[PDB]
């Protein structure tokens, strides 16, 4: 069941972490690989990459196992960073790439917002098109911390049209949970040879194995023997390995995954009607939605009342990404809003 | 229990792996973990580092987890390279240095060994005080794959010498094996602020925890700071952590593991003496021995008959490397040896 939190026991909305514990499949496969785990889990990994790639209809040679995304992102950056180089990223998304790319000296360039938090393509692709060195566009879609898409027939003509000098990478990590048709994966890009093109994906989100640490790069294989030189070979954990092959063949658990996130939603959506307080679409785990008090001062309130939200998310000061927890969790959550509303606290 | 290889069930004395289980309350920690990896070790990654600086006395700072100490071998490669750097390293050892630094772009020095395939630690010096640029020198201690350790009094003075513009990474992976008294861990040098070392270590080895992916480096804070900005963050993997905090308490199987490989240790120099084929002192889990056979032979009859052992390691083209498996696995490798002895196969 579920028991209301505490201090002690909070509810945790906080990384966008699944709710659920991982497919029983999984998890017993996780378990039962302890007692081998004296040894590497070579041919696992083996296995593992070869599946991946016939999931994403390319060989295995277009695939990079990583330990989560965390390390796609980080060899993504290594491999095509220089002094030269810029990052072009939207101002709003996700801290890694930039992280990176300040670690190699590159020049970040951000580009503001439209007036609704999406995506500036246009201002996207002006940033590169002025821009005389090399130039690596990091496009996270549906975005963390918005949840919102960009449409494909706004991200793959840009591609298609190959940019000079302009490697992009393309994070897919909450894709699974998406419901709008204007979306579509960038994945058959990759199978027809596109070889601009690093799409990143996790086990860390729908397939909720967060602390299993499991992620992938799907690209050209030039593409992913160059990021390969800055990773430790594939050397993932053999808990992970185990897990991840099981949870690939439970198609049931994927689709509770999802249905379970969907339900979740709505009651979190329903109380922000009620309280009148704009919120964006979300196509992942999380709602980013709006605030009237002080963004501190609400986070240190929930944290009173047992409800770990999101971190500030500058520049966008004023709103707050709420990772959605179980139905029996959001609403409680919905409820306790409700009663902060009733003493101003929201 | 034991029962006799073939070629689908194997013994595996191929990758230094230790051939009992991890540590039973390590077991139970890392199945345990499985239903909390939904989501992120965030604390008791914390709680993991803090523990392994209060082993090597010195402060949160100063330790850098990873995955593996394979992935602290490429950050500390990184952090220090540089297209004017060196890596000067002994002519046969462990390969990952020499990798990376090949990756950076780095000239790589390697020093031929002595005439008793001892590390020439004088033309390590030479070739070190001879270059005008920056060097990075790699010492693996136990090396692999000879086994044999260098002598504390031979490599701590020249540290502590100070050598301008070099740093110096020692690789301690398999240092809890070792019986020498000569042999010194390099860790006080640190905890008495040491800026000019980082040291590596692995759960992978004494703790049997190889397929759980947990290493990490000691060093001054100010270099950990560097290391750290070429791995993506410390997101260790949930089993892995909580098998290593409890493998930290459970001393009496690290007792066990230990003796254990000293008994393997000594039914297999008892078949050598009595086939007179030269090894050098094994101070880790495997031991360097030489071949009157082609090893390429020799490698492929062992596999015939269900034992993986070493591959080649030019330049000792004539010497194997042989990993030490549980005392029954050994008596029957042992045992093989001689029967191949009688058909000249060995
Ligand atoms: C968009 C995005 N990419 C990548 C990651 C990294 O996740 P992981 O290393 O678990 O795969 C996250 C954070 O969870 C994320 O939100
Ligand atoms: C000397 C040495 N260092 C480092 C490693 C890397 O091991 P891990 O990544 O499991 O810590 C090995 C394992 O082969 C080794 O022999």
């Given at each position: 069941?579920?028991?209301?939190?505490?201090?002690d026991?909070?509810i945790?909305?906080?990384?966008?972490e699944?709710?659920?514990?991982?497919?029983?499949?999984?998890?017993?496969?996780a378990?039962?690989?302890?007692?081998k785990?004296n040894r590497?889990?070579?041919?696992?990994?083996?296995?593992?990459?070869?599946?991946?790639?016939?999931?994403?209809?390319?060989?295995?040679?277009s695939?990079?196992?990583?330990?989560?995304?965390?390390?796609?992102?980080?060899a993504?950056?290594?491999?095509?960073?220089?002094?030269?180089?810029?990052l072009?990223?939207?101002?709003?998304?996700?801290g890694?790439?930039?992280?990176f790319?300040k670690?190699?000296?590159?020049?970040?360039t951000?580009?503001?917002?439209?007036?609704?938090?999406?995506?500036?393509?246009?201002?996207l692709?002006?940033?590169?098109?002025?821009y005389?060195?090399?130039?690596?566009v990091?496009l996270v879609?549906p975005?963390?911390?918005?949840?919102?898409?960009?449409?494909?027939?706004?991200?793959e003509?840009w591609?298609a049209?190959?940019?000079?000098?302009?490697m992009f990478?393309v994070?897919?990590?909450?894709a699974?949970?998406?419901?709008d048709?204007?979306?579509?994966?960038?994945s058959?890009?990759?199978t027809?040879?596109?070889?601009?093109?690093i799409?990143l994906?996790?086990?860390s989100?729908?397939?909720?194995?967060?602390?299993?640490?499991?992620?992938?790069?799907?690209?050209?294989?030039?593409?992913?023997?160059?990021?390969?030189?800055y990773?430790?070979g594939?050397?993932?954990?053999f808990?992970g390995?185990?897990?991840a092959?099981?949870?690939?063949?439970?198609?049931?658990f994927?689709?509770?995954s999802?249905?379970?996130?969907?339900?979740?939603?709505?009651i979190?959506?329903?109380?922000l009607?009620?309280?009148?307080?704009?919120?964006?679409?979300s196509?992942?785990?999380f709602?980013?939605?709006?605030?009237?008090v002080?963004?501190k001062?609400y986070?240190?309130?929930?944290?009173?009342?047992?409800?770990?939200?999101g971190?500030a998310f500058?520049?966008?000061?004023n709103?707050?990404?709420?990772?959605?927890?179980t139905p029996?969790?959001?609403?409680?959550?919905?409820?306790?809003?409700?009663?902060f509303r009733?003493?101003?606290?929201?």
């Amino acid at each position: 069941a579920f028991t209301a939190p505490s201090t002690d026991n909070p509810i945790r909305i906080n990384f966008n972490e699944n709710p659920l514990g991982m497919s029983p499949k999984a998890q017993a496969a996780a378990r039962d690989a302890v007692v081998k785990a004296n040894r590497y889990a070579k041919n696992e990994i083996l296995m593992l990459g070869n599946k991946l790639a016939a999931h994403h209809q390319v060989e295995a040679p277009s695939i990079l196992l990583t330990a989560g995304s965390s390390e796609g992102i980080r060899a993504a950056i290594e491999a095509y960073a220089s002094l030269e180089a810029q990052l072009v990223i939207p101002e709003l998304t996700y801290g890694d790439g930039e992280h990176f790319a300040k670690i190699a000296g590159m020049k970040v360039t951000k580009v503001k917002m439209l007036d609704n938090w999406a995506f500036d393509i246009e201002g996207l692709k002006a940033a590169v098109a002025a821009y005389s060195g090399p130039s690596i566009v990091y496009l996270v879609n549906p975005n963390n911390p918005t949840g919102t898409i960009t449409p494909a027939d706004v991200i793959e003509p840009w591609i298609a049209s190959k940019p000079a000098n302009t490697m992009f990478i393309v994070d897919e990590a909450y894709a699974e949970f998406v419901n709008d048709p204007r979306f579509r994966s960038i994945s058959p890009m990759i199978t027809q040879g596109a070889e601009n093109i690093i799409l990143l994906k996790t086990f860390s989100k729908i397939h909720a194995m967060a602390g299993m640490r499991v992620g992938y790069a799907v690209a050209h294989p030039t593409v992913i023997a160059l990021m390969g030189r800055y990773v430790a070979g594939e050397k993932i954990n053999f808990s992970g390995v185990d897990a991840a092959l099981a949870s690939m063949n439970d198609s049931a658990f994927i689709t509770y995954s999802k249905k379970s996130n969907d339900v979740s939603r709505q009651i979190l959506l329903k109380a922000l009607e009620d309280l009148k307080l704009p919120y964006l679409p979300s196509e992942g785990n999380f709602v980013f939605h709006q605030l009237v008090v002080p963004l501190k001062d609400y986070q240190t309130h929930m944290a009173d009342a047992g409800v770990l939200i999101g971190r500030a998310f500058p520049p966008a000061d004023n709103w707050c990404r709420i990772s959605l927890g179980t139905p029996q969790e959001m609403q409680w959550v919905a409820d306790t809003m409700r009663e902060f509303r009733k003493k101003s606290w929201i």
